[PDB]
Design a protein around this ligand. Structure first.
Ligand SMILES: CN(C)CCN(C)C
Ligand SMILES: [Cl-]
Ligand SMILES: [Cl-]
Ligand SMILES: [Cl-]
Ligand code: NA
Length: 129
């Protein structure tokens, strides 16, 4: 599914991501924009042979099982395919674990490089929330 911007903001809010670990909703929308362009079916293969999945490009080295990332963990206790669903529940639940791991949203390098310190509330401006 390709979400609309405000559409995704609403879904994220309903699943409690808004202000989670102190990160306002616009941080999460901005991260999703630059990770996946709001496409739940996004995938990216990394150099190391792990893969990133879904709207927040969550990786198989730690977070999900894809059967093809030697040595990896599955801390969210999900198949990585669950992160590609039109329903963002599994991506949100897993993002809550990631952002709680110690580095906050810096876990998403694209958030650090493209959202951190910017006017992230612009990503939810206009939205009926
Ligand atoms: C200010 N900018 C980068 C946020 C983008 N919005 C308008 C969707
Ligand atoms: Cl915000
Ligand atoms: Cl594996
Ligand atoms: Cl933090
Ligand atoms: Na894994």
């Amino acid at each position: 599914k390709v979400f609309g911007r405000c559409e995704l903001a609403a879904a994220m809010k309903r699943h409690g991501l808004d202000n989670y670990r102190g990160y306002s909703l616009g941080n999460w929308v901005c991260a999703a924009k630059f990770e996946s362009n709001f496409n739940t079916q996004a995938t990216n293969r990394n150099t190391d042979g792990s893969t990133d999945y879904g709207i927040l490009q969550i990786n198989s080295r730690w977070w999900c099982n894809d059967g093809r990332t030697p040595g990896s963990r599955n801390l969210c206790n999900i198949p990585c395919s669950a992160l590609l669903s039109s329903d963002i529940t599994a991506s949100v639940n897993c993002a809550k674990k990631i952002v709680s791991d110690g580095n906050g949203m810096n876990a998403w390098v694209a958030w650090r490089n493209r959202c951190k310190g910017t006017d992230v509330q612009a990503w939810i401006r206009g939205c009926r929330l």
